[PDB]
């Protein structure tokens, strides 16, 4: 039962992610393997006038986090940022 989520595109560049999400509404997002740091992952998210990018942080027990709160999986991280703003500078909430 392994298929990736419809918004997880492993190979998509930063620039391709910005072009895509400019054609979607605020909060729409994708996850990609990081281009500037091999082995990282990135969430690109449509904000009001532009697309901003967040680095997926990990610890040794394998949690995922972006800011403070920690999650056992990428999907649980996603789901939590559906109702807590992923941006600390404006109000922005993951939506699909």
């Amino acid at each position: 039962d392994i298929e990736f989520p419809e918004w997880f595109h492993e190979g998509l560049s930063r620039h391709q992610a910005e072009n895509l999400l400019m054609g979607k509404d605020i909060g729409f997002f994708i996850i990609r393997a990081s281009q500037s740091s091999p082995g990282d992952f990135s969430i690109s998210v449509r904000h009001e006038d532009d697309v901003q990018h967040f680095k997926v942080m990990r610890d040794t027990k394998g949690n995922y986090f972006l800011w403070t709160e920690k999650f056992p999986s990428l999907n649980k991280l996603v789901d939590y940022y559906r109702t807590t703003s992923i941006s600390k500078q404006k109000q922005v909430f993951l939506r699909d």
Partner: peptide
Amino acid sequence: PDYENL
């Protein structure tokens, strides 16, 4: 390139 949480 910048990231908003770093």
